[PDB]
Structure 1
Amino acid sequence: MATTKRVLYVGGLAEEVDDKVLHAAFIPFGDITDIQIPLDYETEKHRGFAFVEFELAEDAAAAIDNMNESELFGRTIRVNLAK
């Protein structure tokens, strides 16, 4: 099976959370190669979720375990393999 295990889905993001906040919150688990945040151009705000891609799958795994249901900017977030 060749499907990646390096990309994580991160949901439950407060309005104040952006790519910088995400980088800072997930870098403790390992180097990150990409962070994508879908936007609504009518509002200019994100839709409450993002995808974080780690360099190593092992690091992505540790992040899922420690960050799923953790608190970020006052609320609970959801973290799991994106696909």
Structure 2
Amino acid sequence: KRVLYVGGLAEEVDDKVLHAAFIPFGDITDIQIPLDYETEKHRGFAFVEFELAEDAAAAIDNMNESELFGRTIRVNLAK
């Protein structure tokens, strides 16, 4: 449980986007946003797995229901 599970990745959302949006808490060692391979479009389900539990946790608790590209992202409990 060292990650933020962020459903709601906008159109212009990349792995860099999630890693930078969660890195100010802690160093994102892995990241990716799951796209149906029929679209090349992020679908609103992403994983930013950093190295620090405190980091990922305070980020999941802080950035809850935010707005990015005008679209609401929600970074919550990765299970």
Q: Distance in 2 between matches of 1:76 and 1:46?
A: 13
Deviations 1:11-60 (A, max 9, x none): 11211111111122111111111002222222122222201101011111
Unmatched segments (≥5 aa) in structure 2: none
Q: Distance in 1 between matches of 2:36 and 2:58?
A: 31
Given that 2:22 and 2:56 are in contact with CA atoms closer than 8 Å, whether structure 1 keeps it comes out as no
Scaled by the length of structure 1, what TM-score is found? 0.83
Aligned residues between the structures: 79
Structure 1 ranges of 4+ moved more than 2 A? none
Given that 1:9 and 1:80 are in contact with CA atoms closer than 8 Å, whether structure 2 keeps it comes out as yes
Given that 2:8 and 2:43 are in contact with CA atoms closer than 8 Å, whether structure 1 keeps it comes out as no
Q: Distance in 2 between matches of 1:15 and 1:26?
A: 18
> Percent identity over the alignment?
100
Q: Distance in 2 between matches of 1:19 and 1:36?
A: 5
Unmatched segments (≥5 aa) in structure 1: none
Given that 2:9 and 2:33 are in contact with CA atoms closer than 8 Å, whether structure 1 keeps it comes out as no
Scaled by the length of structure 2, what TM-score is found? 0.86
Q: Distance in 2 between matches of 1:37 and 1:77?
A: 12
Shift of 1:68: 0.8
Q: Distance in 2 between matches of 1:19 and 1:8?
A: 13
